[PDB]
Amino acid sequence: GSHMNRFLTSIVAWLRAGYPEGIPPTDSFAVLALLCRRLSHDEVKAVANELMRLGDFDQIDIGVVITHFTDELPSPEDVERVRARLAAQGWPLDDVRDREEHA
Asked: Could you list the residue range(s) of the whole structural domain that residue 68 is in?
């Protein structure tokens, strides 16, 4: 019983759950950098678009950055920042074996 749309919905939820105060443009690029490791740039472009429409995102251009990256950006401290914050709501970005490894 797999539903594709529900996946996107949960992704949106996770992302905005990481920032219930709204993502600032600096770590928005961090978000795209992290998410692009799991999802294709068009997929993240789509979810970013709908998330910005939903309101729980700052109104910038993520689609431009994911299709045309920067060399020095996004900032490493920002990616580590979003990494630390989003980890609190879980991490479906990577794959984790169910076992008490790190709590």
From this structure: 3-90
Method of determination is NMR
- The structural domain count of the chain equals 1
Whether 29 and 74 have beta carbons less than 8 Å apart is answered as yes
Running DSSP on this structure, what letter comes out for residue 63?
H
Task: Determine, yes or no, domain membership for 95.
Answer: no
Strand residue runs (E) in 1-103: none
SS3 state of residue 45: helix
Tell whether 100 is covered by a domain: no
Q: Are the CB atoms for 67 and 3 separated by under 8 Å?
A: no
Q: Specify the 3-state DSSP secondary structure of 43.
A: helix
Residue 83: Cβ-neighbour burial (10 angstroms; 0-12, 13-18, 19+)? middle
In whole angstroms, give the CA distance from residue 85 to residue 64: 24
Residue 8 covered by a domain: yes
